[PDB]
Amino acid sequence: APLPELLSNNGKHALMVDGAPYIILGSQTNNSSNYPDALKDVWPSMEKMGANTLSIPVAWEQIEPVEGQFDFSFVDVLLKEARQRKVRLVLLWFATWKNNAPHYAPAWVKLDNARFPRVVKEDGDTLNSLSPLGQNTLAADKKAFVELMKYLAKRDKDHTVIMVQVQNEVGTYGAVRDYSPMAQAVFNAAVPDDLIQKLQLKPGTWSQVFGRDADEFFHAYQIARYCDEVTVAGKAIKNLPMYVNVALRNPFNPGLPGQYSSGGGTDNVLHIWKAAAPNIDLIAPDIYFRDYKTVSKVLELYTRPDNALFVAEIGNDQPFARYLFPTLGKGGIGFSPFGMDDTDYTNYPLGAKVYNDETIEQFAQVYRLVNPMMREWARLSYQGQVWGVAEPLDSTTETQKIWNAEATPEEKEQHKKDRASALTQQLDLGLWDAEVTYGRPMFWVTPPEGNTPAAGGALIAQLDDNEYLVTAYKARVEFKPSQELAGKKFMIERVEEGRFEKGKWVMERVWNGDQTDWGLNFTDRPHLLRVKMASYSVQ
Amino acid sequence: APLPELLSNNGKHALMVDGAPYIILGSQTNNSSNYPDALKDVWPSMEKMGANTLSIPVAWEQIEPVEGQFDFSFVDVLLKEARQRKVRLVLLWFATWKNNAPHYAPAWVKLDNARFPRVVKEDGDTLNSLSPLGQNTLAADKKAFVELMKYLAKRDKDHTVIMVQVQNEVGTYGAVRDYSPMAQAVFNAAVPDDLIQKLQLKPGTWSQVFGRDADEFFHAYQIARYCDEVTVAGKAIKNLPMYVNVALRNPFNPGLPGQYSSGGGTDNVLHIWKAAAPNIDLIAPDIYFRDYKTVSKVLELYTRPDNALFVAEIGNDQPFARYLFPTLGKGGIGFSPFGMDDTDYTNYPLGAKVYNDETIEQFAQVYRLVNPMMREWARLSYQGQVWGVAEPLDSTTETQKIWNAEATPEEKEQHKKDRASALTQQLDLGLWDAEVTYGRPMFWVTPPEGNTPAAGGALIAQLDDNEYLVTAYKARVEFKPSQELAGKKFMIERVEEGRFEKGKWVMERVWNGDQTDWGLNFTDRPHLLRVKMASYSVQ
Ligand SMILES: OC[C@H]1NC[C@H](O)[C@@H](O)[C@H]1O
Ligand SMILES: OC[C@H]1NC[C@H](O)[C@@H](O)[C@H]1O
Ligand code: NA
DSSP states (O other): OOOOEEEEETTEEEEEETTEEEOEEEEEOOTTOOSGGGGGGTHHHHHHHTOSEEEEEEEHHHHOSBTTBOOOHHHHHHHHHHHHTTOEEEEEEEEEEETTBOTTSOHHHHTOTTTSOEEEOTTSOEEEEEOTTOHHHHHHHHHHHHHHHHHHHHHOTTOSEEEEEEEESOSBSSSSSOOSHHHHHHHHSBOOHHHHHHHTOOOOBHHHHHGGGHHHHHHHHHHHHHHHHHHHHHHHHOOOOEEEEEEOOOSSSOOOBTTBOBTSOOGGGHHHHHHHOTTSOEEEEEEOOOSHHHHHHHHHHHOBTTBOOEEEEEOOSGGGGGGHHHHHHTTOOEEEEBOOSOSSOOOTTSSOSSOSHHHHHHHHHHHHHHGGGHHHHHHHHHHSOEEEEEOOSOOOOHHHHHHHHSSOHHHHHHHHHHHHHHTEEEEEOSSEEEEEEOSOOSSSOOOOOOOSSOOOEEEEEEEETTEEEEEEESEEEEEEESSOOSSEEEEEEEEEEEEEETTEEEEEEEEOTHHHHTBEEEOSSOOOEEEEEEEEEOO | OOOOEEEEETTEEEEEETTEEEOEEEEEOOTTOOSGGGGGGTHHHHHHHTOSEEEEEEEHHHHOSBTTBOOOHHHHHHHHHHHHTTOEEEEEEEEEEETTBOTTSOHHHHTOTTTSOEEEOTTSOEEEEEOTTOHHHHHHHHHHHHHHHHHHHHHOTTOSEEEEEEEESOSBSSSSSOOSHHHHHHHHSBOOHHHHHHTTOOOOBHHHHHGGGHHHHHHHHHHHHHHHHHHHHHHHHSOOOEEEEEEOOOSSSOOOBTTBOBTSOOGGGHHHHHHHOTTSOEEEEEEOOOSHHHHHHHHHHHOBTTBOOEEEEEOOSGGGGGGHHHHHHTTOOEEEEBOOSOSSOOOTTSSOSSOSHHHHHHHHHHHHHHGGGHHHHHHHHHHSOEEEEEOOSOOOOTHHHHHHHSSOHHHHHHHHHHHHHHTEEEEEOSSEEEEEEOSOOSSSOOOOOOOSSOOOEEEEEEEETTEEEEEEESEEEEEEESSOOSSEEEEEEEEEEEEEETTEEEEEEEEOTHHHHTBEEEOSSOOOEEEEEEEEEOO
16 A cells, blocks of 8 residues: 655645545544553544544653663554554654653653753743753654654554654743753854745844744744654654644734743744744644634634645534534644543543543534545545535623623614624635525524534535535535526526445435425534536526 | 225215225325435334325436436335335325426426426516426426326336325416416417306406406416326326325415415415316315414315315424314315425424424324224215314413413403313214313313313214214313203213224223213323213103
């Protein structure tokens, strides 16, 4: 089988797996599930979820517990169990940084500051975050990572592991950069030529060329170089796609670097990361903002002609499930909810308060829409035109439920009109437009009021000028001409519900009558439709 | 087996099936269930309901997807599966009109307006409703319908299919008639002689003879002729009963034609339809009005010496179930709730908000009263005297629950009296009268307060001068002399609960004592009674 690879062309991207585009319908374990005994608490969630790919840590501490004495017993069990369950793997290399810190590095690393130095604050105090200028640290991380890749090269010939995450949420909390003498010497020196060339800047020292951004851009650059070197060394052994994941700053109201994780691939340093680390395939957002506007903004910032969108982590509470739709609609290669196992942990308030079948089912229900067409969607999402939307009002707050209750009948009617309008999305599909609305009956035209809780969305792919592939969830999708018809009329020509078998469309039934009079109405159950529109002459 | 046929005699009617009267205890699928793959979501509901007859579409688009290339693969599967389940079929020919529009006509029909022309408004705009004056449209519909009938002639010798509906809810929304030049020419001309003779009118042009009703009567007449020609051609192949179903106007407050579907068999044009389409066996109301008075009025309007009553569609929400009783009481030949399948659709607000076992059970419970005596009831309903009533107050409406709560103890007592009186119905059964009351204990005489929700009803057939067949549901039925007795007394002589086996009555037990002291009290469980009354001398 050909190696997995990330392709980028015409500003679009595909994760190739076994020689064709692939979508990661993912799940990630909790942080302490990377042991053989924990896997029995992982697989059942994955099965219930319908996930095709598991993201799970492989820790430097577990593979090199004593320097030079490697142990791949976990990776062995993991590969074998994944294959038995017919799922793929993304391994998360928890090493120099996990959430800014070295807790997953071996004891002989994290307890030897002299050999493996920490970031020093401007005031001289030390933080528990390893400096990217530590050359011994880099050499050691690199050597262990290379051994892991050698294990895969020798023992995973069919590429059960399809991607590797290098480190986990790199950066530093509590300072902007390393201010140690070692780091200060490099900061005071000239900005490297390659970076100056790539950003088309005037040469100089860090402070000269970057000014108020020098400290942060420096930390970002040095971390990016470190991760790039690890990535290169591993890829020289087996050239799997590799990526880094970002502890995000709020894109609207970030606060200061150091409050957020300074030096990671935050939106303001993506240009530094892309220049510094050309061997890292993509930079992936970790999404735990619950609210639609902020999530939408993150998706927009991380989807670029030079950056495939991969939602490497997202919260596992109910409101997050619907963000699958815009993720895929942006041409995303994957989506991976965090903490999908029964090892007695919840990261509430980030995720679900309780982990149970209902938690899982919120994601299972949206995965069921994509699984039946995964390869076909993946191809259209690289080579063609796709769209995806989610229900754009968050669930109504208690504060808003009180403001609603004390309103004035004229204010209530007006608020309902405003909500209806906000819950109506328009998409330009070329000759045809779609309108997506949320939370209304399947019959007649009473205006949308939203689902409770917010949960809906829709996917659309263009198959031809007048033909679209459509599936949606707790929503209505309606089609109309994109531009005025010169005395013509229009209608739905045909809607077929069906499936793909061996890449061929098989029709199950035609939607007509009630099922197409009031748009195309979807509940929680999966239906995949091919919709053919027609304008026709009446002259 | 003899062909099914609709008999009419002495102002009464019977649907003959296999040589004897038959009652359709029906169910109708949702509009997009007319495919082999959907049938697995249809049969279980039918079984749970206890229905004996399934109404399901056969679409022109599916049988003639390319002109001249016929495909009966769906009809084949459907016939075979129906027979395996030992049920009968009513096929619904979705063709030139389905709900006023051509969406179920093939693409080569509906997208070719030049060949198959649409209704043109008085202002020159075109509506998506095919004109009944289109001669190509008629020929093409007729040809396909004839092929369907040929399929049944050759492949359904035992008449699994017992009746065919020609079109579905014909007419036009948004205009009263076709105002195209083609139509305007026929409108300006003389009203056809046969119509002038049949309605005993003075000859003239449409506007002269009909005045303010000309536009609507013209559309009705032209549609009726079209449907009659299709019907005749099909019957020449196999002479099954055939009917049309009506998108009803509100009989008390109709609004204007075009707001309602103009040209269909609405109550104000039944005379036009009966004169124009003598080959169509009956005109069937589609009932979605929820309230007792309006439903009752519809049943009254559509039950005529020249029109067998068939409730071809009724809403599937709980309040509609009880209308089975007055339907059968009027000598109706059948009753068919709409949307009885699990294909992920509800026509709420017309039907039930959620489709589940409870939805089905509301109809199952009333069908269980009739199924055990279906052939016996059908014969009595043609040859004899039958009666049927439903609970005449709709379920109490929130607004009324508030008005009741803020009343004055004298106003509450008075309201309760008024309700009790409204919930008491009197029936003249010849020598004996019955009084039916709803929502009271099975013992003693506390006045009726109604069921919650409204749900009760009763069926009575006369077996002899003093003997009646009775079954009822969430109601009390009491008998008394119809005439003052000349110094005689009366009593129940005997009440037997039982069943029919090979057309013979088999007694299970005698109701007496508590069971007959306070009338005949019925809950949700089925009991079929023979009630013999007696007057006796005490002189
Ligand atoms: O549960 C919080 C979550 N935050 C993001 C990190 O990448 C994850 O490992 C985890 O710590
Ligand atoms: O669900 C509404 C119902 N209205 C009446 C039509 O005859 C049916 O086919 C269906 O459209
Ligand atoms: Na456009």
